[PDB]
Swiss-Prot record, chain A:
Other comments on record: The erythromycin sensitive allele is dominant over the resistant allele.
GO aspect biological process, one term: ribosome assembly
Single GO term (MF): DNA binding
Protein's recorded name: Large ribosomal subunit protein uL4
Cellular component, GO, one term: cytoplasm
Record gene name: rplD
Lineage: Bacteria, Pseudomonadati, Pseudomonadota, Gammaproteobacteria, Enterobacterales
Annotated region (Disordered), positions in chain: 24-51
Keyword Repeat set for record: no
Subunit relationships: Part of the 50S ribosomal subunit. In TnaC-stalled ribosomes forms part of the binding pocket for L-Trp with the leader peptide and uL22.
Domain of life: Bacteria
Transmembrane segments: none
Keyword Transcription: yes
Swiss-Prot record, chain B:
One of the record's GO cellular component terms: cytosolic large ribosomal subunit
Biased composition (Gly residues): 20-30
Entry protein name: Large ribosomal subunit protein uL15
Lineage, broadest ranks: Bacteria, Pseudomonadati, Pseudomonadota, Gammaproteobacteria, Enterobacterales
Entry similarity comment: Belongs to the universal ribosomal protein uL15 family.
Gene3D superfamilies membership: 3.100.10.10
Swiss-Prot record, chain C:
GO molecular function, one term: structural constituent of ribosome
Keyword Hydrolase: no
Protein name per UniProt: Large ribosomal subunit protein bL35
Biased composition (Basic residues): 9-21
Subunit composition and interactions: Part of the 50S ribosomal subunit.
Record keyword Methyltransferase present: no
Sorted UniProt keywords: Ribonucleoprotein, Ribosomal protein
Gene Ontology CC annotations of this record: cytoplasm; cytosolic large ribosomal subunit
Family: Belongs to the bacterial ribosomal protein bL35 family.
Region described as Disordered: 1-21
Swiss-Prot record, chain D:
Pfam families to which the protein is assigned, alphabetical: Ribosomal_L20
Assembly information from the UniProt record: Part of the 50S ribosomal subunit. Contacts L21.
Organism ancestry: Bacteria, Pseudomonadati, Pseudomonadota, Gammaproteobacteria, Enterobacterales
Lineage top rank: taxon: Bacteria
Listed InterPro entries: Ribosomal_bL20, RIBOSOMAL_L20_CS, Ribosomal_protein_bL20_C
Cellular component terms (Gene Ontology): cytoplasm; cytosol; cytosolic large ribosomal subunit
Keywords: Ribonucleoprotein, Ribosomal protein, RNA-binding, rRNA-binding
One GO-annotated biological process of the protein: ribosomal large subunit assembly
Name this protein carries in UniProt: Large ribosomal subunit protein bL20
Stated family: Belongs to the bacterial ribosomal protein bL20 family.
GO molecular function, one term: mRNA binding
Purpose of the protein: One of the primary rRNA binding proteins, it binds close to the 5'-end of the 23S rRNA. It is important during the early stages of 50S assembly.
Gene: rplT
NCBIfam families per record: rplT_bact (TIGR01032)
Length: 181, 143, 61, 117
RNA sequence: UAGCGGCGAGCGAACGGGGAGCAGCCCAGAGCCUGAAUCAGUGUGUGUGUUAGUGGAAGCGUCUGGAAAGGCGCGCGAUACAGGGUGACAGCCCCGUACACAAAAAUGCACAUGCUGUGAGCUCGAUGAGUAGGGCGGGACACGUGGUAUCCUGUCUGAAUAUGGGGGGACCAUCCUCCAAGGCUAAAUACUCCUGACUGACCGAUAGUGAACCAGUACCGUGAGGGAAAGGCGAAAAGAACCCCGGCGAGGGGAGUGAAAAAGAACCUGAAACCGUGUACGUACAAGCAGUGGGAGCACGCUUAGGCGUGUGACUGCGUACCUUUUGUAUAAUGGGUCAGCGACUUAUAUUCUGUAGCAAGGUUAACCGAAUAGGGGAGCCGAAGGGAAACCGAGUCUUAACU
RNA sequence: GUAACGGGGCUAAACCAUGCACCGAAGCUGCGGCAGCGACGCUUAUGCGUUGUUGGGUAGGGGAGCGUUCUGUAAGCCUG
RNA sequence: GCUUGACUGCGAGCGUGACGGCGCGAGCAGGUGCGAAAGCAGGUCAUAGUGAUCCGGUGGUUCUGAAUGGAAGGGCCAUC
């Protein structure tokens, strides 16, 4: 299907904001530890007006509007998500960045064997997806930075973009096309 | 391709940053103007405050009541009446086709949209043209 | 925090089809004998909310 | 995130003080005073770019009137003579001529006389 | 939402539904057979976790450089390319990380077991009285005495016992349901003084706790209490032997370490205010927001060698700072001694409007389950039909006996 | 402290009436450029050729940008 | 002299107020009075003679009635 750039943009921004966690806070003039004493009398002196050491205008005060642990989780519509994935795979095919084979596994947990197989396939920064998940296949590409191995259910459009080519199990293609419908 | 994305133009709007310079237009006072209760920290009237003058929600009479019966009646169009899982229309199966709801005890079959299929209708109140439409497809009034 | 309802406005008003609200006339609970039947017959039905007041009703909802 | 202001503030202050080199005292040294005098210098610049034209035109007219009275005529009758002789030479060039080559100016005066009478 | 309310401001349910967790029992009592499940105490074994730990892969050469992890050429390991440190940026130098293992001793927990207690199951019957109600006064139920159900009672009273009692929002009748005036109950729920591991579009010495540093210290106050400031030599002290001046000083010039001393202990970088020294130009008959415009002279830097460039500014036209509040300010109305740092329309959930994206008479889920942004879950909300206070009707509805 | 033309100063440099010149502002025109709004054709406001027009501005409304910190692109690029 | 039009339900349209409101009104249906009839009468020749809402009083009621039938209450119409 033709490419909907603004839709895909909205979806990937939502996914990154979902990756973001809300761990920050500061202290207000309620939470700065101190006293409610007026530092000096309202009148009599030639100094400024004074009410509390805790105000942000004073040194060692609060922040004027302190931060709270806020959830950045956006809401993604299911049809918008699925249309973004349909468009993103169609654009992968149009960029010729997608290869489909029947079988892709190796029967030993060795990154040496995996790297030799990727050299034999002429592959550098790729994305592996499976029908069902193999022990040794996942173990052989955990330690490889440019390669992620996943189940066909656990997909994200951001890693569908980020890796230079995507290779797919044919059973995974069947599961994806069933899962999109 | 990840660094090649711009959204739809005019979707992300810039936003107002007040009190941060003359050339913005929102320099001194930032859209709030000079002195006044409106020119204060949380200086705000309530809803419908017309000064001391007695407002429109307060100088008029209050009237009416709530039936506690209309809230548990509802209304049924003609298009829906086809999603009743088979072709019978009851207090049930509309409740189970999720058009009316659980607490509903009474119902009416108002003419709205084309009706297509023969439908047996059981135990409702039925309007004039919609009765004739249900009979035009082949249905029948039945208590 | 959902918006609190102005309950007086909810009692004195109800919404029509094209977004207008309806209201009931004043001058109808007491003194009526020195008034005219023509005036009270004008006052007895309900009417629509005027132009400048819709903000001060919708804010109350 | 928290943003600090030192580098950009130093850049703006340094730019204004660069524009305010050669001023007297706090006018050269202090932002709160230099920032005023640079804006006032902008005002006076915006004014005097106009006022150059008035001041140079009255300089030119002074020199033309002087040389015309040397050659025996007034400025008013001289300009009227040029307009009736259909002469479109302006006061900049006439002033430069009346300084350098007197005889050309004298001939222009004689043409204005012949166009006048 | 329905309700409460000087029916003002504000307070704000219940029914019913969708989910995590689900678990039931004993006394007011005597017989009959009697440890028969339960838990409570005491131990044993097993599993698993805590309190120390063990092993743990594979790199060289050249070049710049004070120093190699960097550059170039060639290799190897990887269930470890998480992270940290080593003279700059390291998978292969070190500690670790993935994986694989470990307990004489005290423990947490979960099973099974043995020892002591209590009590299983069946018949017959027993079914919590100054209590339920009621008058006065207050409080809670979202419900301010309101027509106000229901609970609690400080004072005064005061029933019935399965043919009986209570509730169904004043109350009466019918009907429906329940059995109060005795007790126990795991889980799912709320919190982090403390311990381990990990994450951060959180901060980076005026920030972040008050405190990166001998902080609740110095200091103020009788006391309660208040309450700061102050981080960085260098990679390694190799922290400056020795000579000279000076007062056996403080401080300095050489030597010297070092890549660097203008990194010499006030120590990385070293801005600005402020204060000096040197050079160039102007100023000692000339008045005022000190500039701007024109412009003579002087001194340097360029050359196509005409003068374009900089520094200075004799003389001259014009010319009363900025903010704020104002009808209006040079105003003698306010504010500012100056620099540097900090400092003021943000946040969450609702509503509406615009723009944009999706879907489309449909749109969309929330809480929850979940190899946890996927997918289930459509309980619910909004919209397509309104009118009328309402029963009620419906492309019509309301008023009216009735409308063209 | 002159102090009742701004001054010097004037028997016209004052006053009444007439004519022709001239000066005089950021107004008007000439040149060169920027932007907005139209109106035009190739073509789709991507633009190009004109041509008309507008462009003082507080509170205030709208539209478009720069610069700083942090995250992804970034085991990539620059750097003893 | 005769009489109850100082009747009811409506209102094309207009005016005047920011708004609540206030005022003028031909004409329709019913049903009256006066005149023989054409016709007139929705109070006074007009412009002032007034009080919002809430709260509660009284009368009427094709409304509602917290399990059902009633009732208390709430609404609507008239009015204090
Ligand atoms: Mg105090
Ligand atoms: Mg601090
Ligand atoms: Mg602070
Ligand atoms: Mg403005
Ligand atoms: Mg102000
Ligand atoms: Mg004012
Ligand atoms: Mg104001
Ligand atoms: Mg539903
Ligand atoms: Mg409308
Ligand atoms: Mg009334
Ligand atoms: Mg300087
Ligand atoms: Mg070891
Ligand atoms: Mg190792
Ligand atoms: Mg270094
Ligand atoms: Mg009992
Ligand atoms: Mg009582
Ligand atoms: Mg610092
Ligand atoms: Mg010494
Ligand atoms: Mg120092
Ligand atoms: Mg230093
Ligand atoms: Mg002199
Ligand atoms: Mg002057
Ligand atoms: Mg200011
Ligand atoms: Mg003042
Ligand atoms: Mg003003
Ligand atoms: Mg002035
Ligand atoms: Mg002064
Ligand atoms: Mg002043
Ligand atoms: Mg002052
Ligand atoms: Mg400053
Ligand atoms: Mg979901
Ligand atoms: Mg002229
Ligand atoms: Mg001019
Ligand atoms: Mg002009
Ligand atoms: Mg032009
Ligand atoms: Mg403008
Ligand atoms: Mg009644
Ligand atoms: Mg009830």
């Amino acid at each position: 299907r033709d490419f909907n750039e603004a839709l895909v943009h909205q979806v990937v921004v939502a996914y990154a904001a979902g990756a973001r966690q809300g761990t920050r806070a500061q202290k207000t003039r309620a939470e700065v530890t101190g006293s409610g004493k007026k530092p000096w009398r309202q009148k009599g002196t030639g100094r400024a007006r004074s009410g509390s050491i805790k105000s942000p205008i004073w040194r060692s005060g609060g922040v004027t509007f302190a931060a709270r642990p806020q959830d950045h989780s956006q809401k993604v519509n299911k049809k918008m998500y699925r249309g973004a994935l349909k468009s993103i795979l169609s654009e992968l095919v149009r960029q010729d960045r997608l290869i489909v084979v029947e079988k892709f596994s190796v029967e030993a947990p060795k990154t040496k064997l995996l790297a030799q197989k990727l050299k034999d396939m002429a592959l550098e920064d790729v994305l592996i997806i499976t029908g069902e998940l193999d022990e040794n296949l996942f173990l052989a590409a955990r330690n490889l930075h440019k390669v992620d191995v996943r189940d066909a259910t656990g997909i994200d459009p951001v890693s569908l973009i980020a890796f230079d080519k995507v290779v797919m199990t044919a059973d995974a293609v069947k599961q994806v096309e069933e899962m999109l419908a | 391709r990840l660094n090649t994305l711009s959204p739809a133009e005019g979707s992300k709007k810039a936003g107002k940053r007040l009190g941060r310079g003359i050339g913005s237009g929102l320099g001194k006072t930032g859209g709030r103007g000079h002195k006044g209760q409106k020119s204060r920290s949380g200086g705000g009237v309530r809803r419908g405050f017309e000064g001391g003058q007695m407002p429109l929600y307060r100088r008029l009479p209050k009237f009416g009541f709530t039936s506690r019966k209309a809230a548990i009646t509802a209304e049924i169009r003609l298009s829906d009446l086809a999603k009743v899982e088979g072709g019978v229309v009851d207090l049930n199966t509309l409740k189970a086709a999720n058009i009316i709801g659980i607490q509903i005890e009474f119902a009416k079959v108002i003419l709205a949209g084309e009706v297509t299929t023969p439908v047996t209708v059981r135990g409702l109140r039925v309007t004039k043209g919609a009765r004739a439409a249900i009979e035009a497809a082949g249905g029948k009034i039945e208590e | 925090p959902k918006i609190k309802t102005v309950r007086g406005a909810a009692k004195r008003f109800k919404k029509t089809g094209k977004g207008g609200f309806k209201h009931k006339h004043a001058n109808l609970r007491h003194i009526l004998t020195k008034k005219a039947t023509k005036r009270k017959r004008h006052l007895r039905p309900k009417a629509m909310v005027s132009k400048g007041d819709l903000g001060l009703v919708i804010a109350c909802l | 995130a928290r943003v600090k202001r030192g580098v950009i503030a130093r850049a703006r202050h340094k730019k204004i003080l660069k524009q305010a080199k050669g001023y007297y005292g706090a006018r050269s040294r202090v932002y709160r005073v230099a920032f005023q005098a640079v804006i006032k210098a902008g005002q006076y610049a915006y004014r005097d770019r106009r006022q150059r034209k008035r001041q140079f035109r009255q300089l030119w007219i002074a020199r033309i009137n002087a040389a015309a009275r040397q050659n025996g005529i007034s400025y008013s009758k001289f300009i009227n003579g040029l307009k009736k002789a259909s002469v479109e030479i302006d006061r900049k060039i006439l002033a430069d001529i009346a300084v350098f080559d007197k005889v050309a100016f004298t001939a222009l005066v004689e043409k204005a006389k012949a166009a006048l009478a």
